[PDB]
């Protein structure tokens, strides 16, 4: 199931980020990332292979992860100038293949694996930023009610998550930044039933799901299965998912007003395909 550490063999060479500290390494030519009593619960956990989930590869103790070129999803929608540009495909693609590997760790057996801190700093991009990778594991603004509730939650609050990253990669705006504050400002809204505005001319289908994944009842909320699947489907309509992120973009980034906002991919194309399917 593992690979062993010697240490001598991973050349490490340069800092990361620090959220514990990260570095790149290289370890028998290949790029790797690497990082108290926490890892016991990982060894159970550690029986997971999927395409859209880090690949989980010890004095100091360390952990393996394959490395991720792209970075996260959060610094290539909100990062440091130049920013990239990207499509409505890349913003159905990304969240699909997260509900992919969403879905796998809800499916194992003995017992189904919430990931819990389901967010865009944990989503990492490879392969010119179009494919998605999970990094199992002030996140007011994706934490479904019930859990900081306090109350016992179910997986139904990735659900919750992945709602709201649907709507953050549709509008390029970071949910619930005009609340901002301290956290419990946000919990404090989104407990009493505030979420993020709708969007300006998005497809009836997409909306649908969206606020159905919103739902204060949490069994109101589709399963990632469900979920799955749906992305999938809709993905005929979103051709140009695998085209690589290279073209500069300079975000201007209006007011939200009349309780809506306008969304920052474009969906003309698939009001297009769709038309030629229905009728
Ligand atoms: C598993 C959750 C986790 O640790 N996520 C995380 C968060 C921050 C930094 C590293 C990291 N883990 C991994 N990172 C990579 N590759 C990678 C991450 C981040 C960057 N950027 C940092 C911000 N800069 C502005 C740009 C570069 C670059 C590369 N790969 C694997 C892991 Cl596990």
Redesign the pocket.
């Known amino acids: 199931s593992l690979h062993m550490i010697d240490y001598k063999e991973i050349e490490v060479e340069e800092v990361?980020?620090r959220?514990?500290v990260?570095c790149?390494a290289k370890w028998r030519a290949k790029d790797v990332?690497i990082?108290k009593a926490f890892i016991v619960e990982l060894r159970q956990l550690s029986r997971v292979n999927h395409p859209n989930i880090?690949k989980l590869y010890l004095n100091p103790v360390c952990l393996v992860?394959?490395?991720?070129?792209?970075?996260?999803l959060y610094?290539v929608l909100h990062?440091?100038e130049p920013l990239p540009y990207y499509t409505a495909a890349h913003a159905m693609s990304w969240c699909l293949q997260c509900s992919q590997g969403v879905a796998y760790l809800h499916s194992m057996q003995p017992k189904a694996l919430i990931h819990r801190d389901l967010k865009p700093?944990?989503l990492?991009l490879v392969a010119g930023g179009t494919v998605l990778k999970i990094?199992?594991?002030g996140s007011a603004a994706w934490m479904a009610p019930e859990v900081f509730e306090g109350s016992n939650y179910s997986e139904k609050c990735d659900v919750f998550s992945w709602g709201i990253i649907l709507w953050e990669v549709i509008t390029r705006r970071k949910p619930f930044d005009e609340i901002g504050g301290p956290a419990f400002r946000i919990m404090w809204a989104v407990h009493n039933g505030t979420r993020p505005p709708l969007i300006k001319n998005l497809p009836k289908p997409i909306e649908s799901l969206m606020t159905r994944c919103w739902s204060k009842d949490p069994s109101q909320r589709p399963s990632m299965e469900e979920i799955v699947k749906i992305m999938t489907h809709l993905m005929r309509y979103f051709p140009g998912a695998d085209e690589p992120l290279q073209y500069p973009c300079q975000h201007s980034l209006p007011p939200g007003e009349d309780g809506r906002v306008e969304p920052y991919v474009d969906f003309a194309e698939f009001y297009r395909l769709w038309s030629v399917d229905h009728g």
């Open positions: 990361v980020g959220g514990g990260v790149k990332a990082k880090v992860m394959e490395y991720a070129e792209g970075g996260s610094n990062g440091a700093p944990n990492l990094c199992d594991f």
